[PDB]
Design an enzyme around this catalytic site. Structure first.
Site, PDB file in Angstrom:
ATOM      1  N   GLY A  24      28.192  31.312  57.777  1.00  0.00           N
ATOM      2  CA  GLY A  24      27.610  32.368  56.938  1.00  0.00           C
ATOM      3  C   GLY A  24      28.680  33.358  56.543  1.00  0.00           C
ATOM      4  O   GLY A  24      29.866  33.041  56.694  1.00  0.00           O
ATOM      5  N   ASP A 160      16.614  37.587  52.782  1.00  0.00           N
ATOM      6  CA  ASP A 160      17.020  36.421  51.997  1.00  0.00           C
ATOM      7  C   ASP A 160      16.194  35.206  52.399  1.00  0.00           C
ATOM      8  O   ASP A 160      16.734  34.147  52.718  1.00  0.00           O
ATOM      9  CB  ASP A 160      18.517  36.130  52.152  1.00  0.00           C
ATOM     10  CG  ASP A 160      19.035  35.155  51.096  1.00  0.00           C
ATOM     11  OD1 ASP A 160      18.379  35.019  50.037  1.00  0.00           O
ATOM     12  OD2 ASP A 160      20.094  34.528  51.318  1.00  0.00           O
ATOM     13  N   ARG A 164      16.450  27.262  51.977  1.00  0.00           N
ATOM     14  CA  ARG A 164      17.775  27.028  52.608  1.00  0.00           C
ATOM     15  C   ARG A 164      17.796  27.704  53.983  1.00  0.00           C
ATOM     16  O   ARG A 164      18.463  27.195  54.828  1.00  0.00           O
ATOM     17  CB  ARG A 164      18.940  27.529  51.742  1.00  0.00           C
ATOM     18  CG  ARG A 164      19.851  28.561  52.394  1.00  0.00           C
ATOM     19  CD  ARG A 164      21.126  27.907  52.877  1.00  0.00           C
ATOM     20  NE  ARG A 164      22.121  28.612  53.661  1.00  0.00           N
ATOM     21  CZ  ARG A 164      21.891  29.201  54.815  1.00  0.00           C
ATOM     22  NH1 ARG A 164      20.723  29.098  55.388  1.00  0.00           N
ATOM     23  NH2 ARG A 164      22.808  29.928  55.397  1.00  0.00           N
ATOM     24  N   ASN A 165      17.046  28.795  54.141  1.00  0.00           N
ATOM     25  CA  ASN A 165      17.030  29.539  55.397  1.00  0.00           C
ATOM     26  C   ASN A 165      15.832  29.208  56.285  1.00  0.00           C
ATOM     27  O   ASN A 165      15.544  29.924  57.245  1.00  0.00           O
ATOM     28  CB  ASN A 165      17.069  31.044  55.119  1.00  0.00           C
ATOM     29  CG  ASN A 165      18.460  31.532  54.763  1.00  0.00           C
ATOM     30  OD1 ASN A 165      19.451  31.049  55.307  1.00  0.00           O
ATOM     31  ND2 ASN A 165      18.539  32.498  53.852  1.00  0.00           N
ATOM     32  N   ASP A 178      18.082  32.867  60.678  1.00  0.00           N
ATOM     33  CA  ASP A 178      18.903  33.993  60.237  1.00  0.00           C
ATOM     34  C   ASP A 178      18.084  35.161  59.696  1.00  0.00           C
ATOM     35  O   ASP A 178      18.381  35.693  58.626  1.00  0.00           O
ATOM     36  CB  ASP A 178      19.899  33.529  59.172  1.00  0.00           C
ATOM     37  CG  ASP A 178      20.937  32.569  59.720  1.00  0.00           C
ATOM     38  OD1 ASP A 178      20.981  32.370  60.954  1.00  0.00           O
ATOM     39  OD2 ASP A 178      21.717  32.020  58.913  1.00  0.00           O
TER      40      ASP A 178
HETATM   41  C1  LIG Z   1      21.529  20.461  66.599  1.00  0.00           C
HETATM   42  C2  LIG Z   1      20.578  20.011  65.496  1.00  0.00           C
HETATM   43  C3  LIG Z   1      21.353  19.894  64.183  1.00  0.00           C
HETATM   44  O1  LIG Z   1      22.553  19.621  64.180  1.00  0.00           O
HETATM   45  N1  LIG Z   1      20.614  20.131  63.088  1.00  0.00           N
HETATM   46  C4  LIG Z   1      21.187  20.039  61.890  1.00  0.00           C
HETATM   47  C5  LIG Z   1      21.735  18.846  61.429  1.00  0.00           C
HETATM   48  C6  LIG Z   1      22.311  18.796  60.166  1.00  0.00           C
HETATM   49  C7  LIG Z   1      22.324  19.934  59.367  1.00  0.00           C
HETATM   50  C8  LIG Z   1      21.764  21.119  59.829  1.00  0.00           C
HETATM   51  F1  LIG Z   1      21.783  22.218  59.041  1.00  0.00           F
HETATM   52  C9  LIG Z   1      21.185  21.180  61.093  1.00  0.00           C
HETATM   53  C10 LIG Z   1      20.639  22.389  61.529  1.00  0.00           C
HETATM   54  O2  LIG Z   1      19.646  22.873  60.987  1.00  0.00           O
HETATM   55  N2  LIG Z   1      21.309  22.976  62.531  1.00  0.00           N
HETATM   56  C11 LIG Z   1      20.890  24.156  62.990  1.00  0.00           C
HETATM   57  N3  LIG Z   1      20.055  24.271  64.020  1.00  0.00           N
HETATM   58  N4  LIG Z   1      19.850  25.456  64.239  1.00  0.00           N
HETATM   59  C12 LIG Z   1      20.542  26.204  63.379  1.00  0.00           C
HETATM   60  C13 LIG Z   1      20.630  27.526  63.232  1.00  0.00           C
HETATM   61  C14 LIG Z   1      21.434  28.062  62.234  1.00  0.00           C
HETATM   62  C15 LIG Z   1      22.134  27.204  61.397  1.00  0.00           C
HETATM   63  O3  LIG Z   1      22.919  27.750  60.417  1.00  0.00           O
HETATM   64  C16 LIG Z   1      23.577  26.878  59.478  1.00  0.00           C
HETATM   65  C17 LIG Z   1      24.751  27.631  58.844  1.00  0.00           C
HETATM   66  C18 LIG Z   1      22.739  26.375  58.456  1.00  0.00           C
HETATM   67  C19 LIG Z   1      21.684  27.092  57.873  1.00  0.00           C
HETATM   68 CL1  LIG Z   1      21.252  28.706  58.344  1.00  0.00          CL
HETATM   69  C20 LIG Z   1      20.922  26.504  56.869  1.00  0.00           C
HETATM   70  N5  LIG Z   1      21.191  25.215  56.418  1.00  0.00           N
HETATM   71  C21 LIG Z   1      22.243  24.505  56.993  1.00  0.00           C
HETATM   72  C22 LIG Z   1      23.005  25.086  57.997  1.00  0.00           C
HETATM   73 CL2  LIG Z   1      24.297  24.182  58.681  1.00  0.00          CL
HETATM   74  C23 LIG Z   1      22.002  25.831  61.598  1.00  0.00           C
HETATM   75  C24 LIG Z   1      21.212  25.377  62.577  1.00  0.00           C
END
Ligand SMILES: *CCC(=O)Nc1cccc(F)c1C(=O)Nc1n[nH]c2ccc(O[C@H](C)c3c(Cl)cncc3Cl)cc12
Length: 300
Positions: A24, A160, A164-165, A178
């Site tokens: 982020g 926001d 996506r969130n 978030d």
């Molecule tokens: C551990 C489970 C996992 O890896 N899930 C996952 C696989 C592939 C892509 C992903 F975005 C995820 C995921 O959602 N991971 C994830 N789990 N909890 C989170 C909390 C925050 C977060 O932030 C990242 C930056 C993010 C957001 Cl907010 C939104 N879209 C994608 C991502 Cl990477 C990710 C996760």
């Protein structure tokens, strides 16, 4: 450095860092293996998401992450949000450990599950049947609403809210992510486009965009956009409209058209969420109830 809060503190040596998930404005997110997150099962493995600073953060970056950690502590536990699991603050880098959603964010979830196209040859009895059905879409919207209702009850504003969130679990449970972020509301680059082509300005309520005013009702506006995202199966809002044109259109009171294959009940709720006067928009409590009626009526 940071004080020890034994309620949330988790031994960092019980974490095994894995693949980076993304980042982020401040800090990055890394998938990790955790052992004994539940103290009753000290050797039990679980998969978690670890938030941490990038490789030179300023103290503002650190302050932002610490601030996020403290928000996470106070908000509490709910089925439809990304919950805090633990923190690592002692003798090493700051880790904020949160729930991991297996299926990624809601936008990509929907886009990857759009119905088969007109070019695909029929193979089997379900050639026309895509992964997504209407009641599941409604359930996605309802869950996000319940999550936002909870966050509102804890006096938390997202600022926001977007597909996506919103993250998706292995069981297709929606979890708002978030929600406790410092998002630099006094220095938003309104023309900023993300690496995946997102223009976050398109989710802002008019009072937020024009007057820098955020309330729960401004989140309701964003939820209306999120509704549109859901029933376009991950479409981008205000199609083909650049930021400059968005400004003037919003000042003229422009609203998005009713998307294809979207019942009037749901476009009705979108338009209600997009009422000019924030008080004229439904509350999340009303949205939950309204969506629940639809959900129950189609869940025979
Ligand atoms: C551990 C489970 C996992 O890896 N899930 C996952 C696989 C592939 C892509 C992903 F975005 C995820 C995921 O959602 N991971 C994830 N789990 N909890 C989170 C909390 C925050 C977060 O932030 C990242 C930056 C993010 C957001 Cl907010 C939104 N879209 C994608 C991502 Cl990477 C990710 C996760």
């Amino acid at each position: 450095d940071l004080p020890l809060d034994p309620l949330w503190e988790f031994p960092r040596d019980r974490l095994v860092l894995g693949k980076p998930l993304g980042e982020g404005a401040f800090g990055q997110v890394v998938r990790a293996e955790a052992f004994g997150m539940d103290p009753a099962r000290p050797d039990q493995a679980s998969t978690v998401a670890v938030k941490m600073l990038k490789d030179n953060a300023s103290d503002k970056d650190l302050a932002d992450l610490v601030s996020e950690m403290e928000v996470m502590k106070l908000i509490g536990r709910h089925k439809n949000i990304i919950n805090l699991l633990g923190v690592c603050t002692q003798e090493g880098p700051l880790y904020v450990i949160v729930e991991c959603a297996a299926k990624g964010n809601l936008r990509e979830f929907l886009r990857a599950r759009r119905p088969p196209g007109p070019d695909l040859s029929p193979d089997g009895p379900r050639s026309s049947e895509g992964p997504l059905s209407f009641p599941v879409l409604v359930s996605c919207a309802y869950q996000v609403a319940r999550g936002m209702q909870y966050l509102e009850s804890r006096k938390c504003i997202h600022r926001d809210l977007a597909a996506r969130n919103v993250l998706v679990t292995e069981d297709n449970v929606m979890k708002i992510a978030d929600f406790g972020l410092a998002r630099g509301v006094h220095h938003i680059d309104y023309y900023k486009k993300t690496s995946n082509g997102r223009l976050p300005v398109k989710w802002m309520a008019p009072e937020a965009l024009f007057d820098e005013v955020y309330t729960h009702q401004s989140d309701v506006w964003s939820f209306g956009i999120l509704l549109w995202e859901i029933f376009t199966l991950g479409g981008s809002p205000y199609p083909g409209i650049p930021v400059e044109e968005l400004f003037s259109l919003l000042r003229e009171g422009h609203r998005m058209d009713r998307p294809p294959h979207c019942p009037p009940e749901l476009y009705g709720l979108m338009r209600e969420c997009w009422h000019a006067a924030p008080s004229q928009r439904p509350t999340f409590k009303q949205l939950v109830e309204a969506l629940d009626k639809v959900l129950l009526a189609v869940s025979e």
